[PDB]
Amino acid sequence: ELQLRPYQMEVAQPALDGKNIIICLPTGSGKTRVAVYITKDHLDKKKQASESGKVIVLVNKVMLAEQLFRKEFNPYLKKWYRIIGLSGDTQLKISFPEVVKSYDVIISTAQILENSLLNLESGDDDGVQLSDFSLIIIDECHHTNKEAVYNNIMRRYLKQKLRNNDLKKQNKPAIPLPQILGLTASPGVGAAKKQSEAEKHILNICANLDAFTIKTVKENLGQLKHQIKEPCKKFVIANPFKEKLLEIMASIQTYCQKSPMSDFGTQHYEQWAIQMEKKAAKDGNRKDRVCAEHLRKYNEALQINDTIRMIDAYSHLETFYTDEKEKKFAVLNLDETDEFLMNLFFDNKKMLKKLAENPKEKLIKLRNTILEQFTRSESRGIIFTKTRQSTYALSQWIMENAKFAEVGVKAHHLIGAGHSSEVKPMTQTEQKEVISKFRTGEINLLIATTVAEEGLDIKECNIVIRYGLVTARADESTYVLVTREIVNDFREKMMYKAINRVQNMKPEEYAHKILELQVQSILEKKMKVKRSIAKQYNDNPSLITLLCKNCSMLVCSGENIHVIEKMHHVNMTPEFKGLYIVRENKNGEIICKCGQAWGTMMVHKGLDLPCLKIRNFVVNFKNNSPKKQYKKWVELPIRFPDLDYSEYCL
RNA sequence: UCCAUGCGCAUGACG
RNA sequence: CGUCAUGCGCAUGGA
Ligand SMILES: Nc1ncnc2c1ncn2[C@@H]1O[C@H](COP(=O)(O)OP(=O)(O)O)[C@@H](O)[C@H]1O
Ligand SMILES: [Zn+2]
């Protein structure tokens, strides 16, 4: 079987000639299948050539790899050729180079391939080359812009290509390089206020891929257009506690002589709070880092309240101050500052809570909007929002709300898996379960945070409602936008025209432009190398000291620290040990004699290790140069010794 | 299956 | 350059 649709046929035609073209098509056109056909044709040709045919397919997300190995490639070609569903998570007893030698076809993930190539350049002796393959295929090429995995990969291919040109002229023989296909929904357009900038961006993409031309369907376009149902665009749009909190912020400002130089509930105030916090850290002073941090917490509460039930802000600060109280209690087992701030809060805490019960509330507007939508439904919907906490708050509020229960439409939250912002990350398994549930109708509506926007298989949904999120199927579209669609349309128009412009270009001029872009990218990479190496020069054993940032006291030295796994830094020598405190709630966490959090107590190879984080400490060189904050160890060019387990045997 | 950690990347907003 | 929010990948250790 594997019959190929017509509009797919023409667009794929050039690649069958060895063309390293790009194929951009819309969503739902099943470019996976045309990709399969192309792979099949390339391999059959290499069979006729009596030469080995290798394909190494790449994706930026794992689940895509699983889907292609599950539903697309193996079904059609499993019996014809060897296929492997490679991924970083899937424990594979065998190393990558072997499967490079042992499988005719490969689904994979970019970073894995890059790591193998790095080992080739390194002394690990695990070797692979883009030349070793006969064909490289990529999905969502549009990510090949800025130091992305795809881009980092192709840059090597280019460099080699230019050497190949020089050798072609200088020498009759030249080394080989593979064909390159690239598939995307749309090449995309970045920060292009002009069709010229857009044209340049597109050309930069093509250069990164080194592709011959872009390809899109116009002749057979009507067939695909009718075949694919495409939704219509649309946009639809719908205190006292805040005042008290602002008053308290002003009270702290008066108590700290802190000038916001900015409005309330704005990013710039937070940015100033952080910069002031850094200055206080370098000054080793309190009510400066401390109160600045407290103010930042307050402004976070504000921005929460600006869109959210102030109950949630009360919960936010309930959590914050209760945990601070617990830290102080552990320390005890308080000064003018902490007492002032804590009491300044607790005094109004009950009143704030009472105010929180009073609705007098964007969320209340969205509730009415949503219920009105549900009356139309007769059943699938997707919410979106900026943050993770937002999704949980929405799900909690909707579940609590009786009206939505009366409607009988269930709802659940959904987020990514990155352990960031100290918020619970959903696991890939859990995400898969939830989307399966919604597809089955177990959950009528799914709250999301851009995870559902792409990758995850969500289709045939009546409505796609949004809640201040910058950005349906089954021939049913109920787009909503509560609180940039026009500007987005303008950009789409611009990129389409730029694409047509590039398609209608001289092959010579086009080749010259893309060649220049290739050279530029290579030069940028070389410059990046130059600066990156210069960063790591000092490599001092011990030229710094770790200090608590609330109480600017020496906490460690430069030499007492040791490294385990060449990842984690730790301080044995219990002179430090008697200082730090331990606390847990629900391996364990570490805190300060001042309540300042310090890190966690990891255990490696059986040694108990009070591991820590540079973020929560402030540097103090031996040269007495000003204090510093790095947010990560690698920023420091000096080198710490790997721990010797023979030492500290005890 | 879960936990914790390190590293890199892109996106949007903001300065 | 920094900030914040969001999403992704890789590599670890333990259970
Ligand atoms: N040659 C073909 N004939 C008929 N339908 C096809 C053909 N090739 C692809 N399709 C359709 O394309 C769909 C696959 O789309 P999919 O790959 O999931 O979307 P996308 O291309 O956006 O990833 C299949 O459901 C299939 O019906
Ligand atoms: Zn302290």
Residue numbers in the entry: 306 to 543, 549 to 643, 669 to 695, 699 to 716, 719 to 811, 823 to 834, 843 to 945, 957 to 1020
Task: Give the article text.
Long cytosolic double-stranded RNA (dsRNA) is recognized by MDA5. MDA5 cooperatively assembles into helical filaments on uninterrupted RNA duplexes longer than a few hundred base pairs (bp). The helicase consists of two RecA-like domains, Hel1 and Hel2, and an insert domain, Hel2i, all of which form contacts with phosphate and ribose moieties of both RNA strands. The helicase and CTD, linked by a pair of α-helices referred to as the pincer domain, form a ring around the RNA.
To complete our structural picture of the MDA5 ATPase cycle, we determined cryoEM structures of ADP-bound WT MDA5-dsRNA filaments in the presence of magnesium (at a physiological concentration). We obtained two similarly populated structural classes, one with an intermediate helical twist (88˚) and the other with a high twist (92˚), with overall resolutions of 3.9 and 3.35 Å, respectively. In both structures, the density in the nucleotide-binding pocket unambiguously corresponds to ADP (or ADP:Mg2+). The filament structure and helical symmetry are similar to those of nucleotide-free filaments, with the helicase in the semi-closed state, and a 2018 Å2protein-RNA interface area (smaller than the ground and transition states). In contrast to the ATP- and transition states, helicase motifs Vc and VI in Hel2 are mostly disordered in the ADP state. Motifs Vc and VI becoming more conformationally dynamic as catalysis proceeds from the transition state to the post-hydrolysis state could cause MDA5 to relax its grip on the dsRNA and ADP. Together with the decrease in total MDA5-RNA contact area that accompanies ATP hydrolysis, this could promote dissociation of imperfect (endogenous) RNA duplexes. In the ADP-bound state, WT MDA5-RNA filament segments had the same broad distribution of low, intermediate, and high twists as in the nucleotide-free state, with intermediate twists being the most abundant. These broad twist distributions, along with the reduced protein-RNA contact area relative to the ground state, are suggestive of more flexible or relaxed states, in which MDA5 has loosened its grip on bound RNA and nucleotide.
